[PDB]
Amino acid sequence: MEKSFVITDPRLPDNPIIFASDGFLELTEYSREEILGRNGRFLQGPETDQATVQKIRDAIRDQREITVQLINYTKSGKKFWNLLHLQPMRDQKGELQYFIGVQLDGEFIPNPLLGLD
């Protein structure tokens, strides 16, 4: 698929998605128009590990890049493993301007290893 990513605006409440790539639409099965303005957690669901969610939340607060692997859901309810790479984007003034999150679909690290401390 074309590279899956979204861009959020941390200068607006709770990181709304301001851009979603064609690859993200293809991976997730959502339309662009229905994605825009959402927080990226809309892809989560019952099987998503809340400990991994908390890691993300801490990295966003700290404006620190992070990679995690977590369960996400397509619009039709299909589960997929998402290796999510989140990167803060700063402007020339050093000010946070965007986050970008790139999704790679796959159980790259087997669940039994991911689950160790």
Ligand X SMILES: Cc1cc2nc3c(=O)[nH]c(=O)nc-3n(C[C@H](O)[C@H](O)[C@H](O)CO)c2cc1C
Binding site for ligand X (CB under 6 A): 6, 8, 15, 39-41, 43-44, 53, 56-57, 60, 70, 72, 82, 84, 86, 99-101, 103
Q: Does 11 bind Cl ion (CB under 5 A)?
A: no
Which residues does 55 contact at the CB level (< 8 Å), separation at least 6?
Answer: 66, 68
Among 3, 11, 32, 57, binds Cl ion (CB under 5 A): 57
DSSP characters for 13-61?
TT--EEEE-HHHHHHH---HHHHTT--GGGG--TTS-HHHHHHHHHHHH
Is 41 or 75 the residue whose CB approaches Cl ion more closely? Answer: 41
CA dihedral 22, 24, 27, 31 (to 10 degrees): -70
21 binds, among Cl ion, ligand X, none (CB under 5 to 8 A by kind): none
Residues touching Cl ion, count (CB under 5 A): 4
Min. distance of Cβ 70 from ligand X in angstroms?
Answer: 6
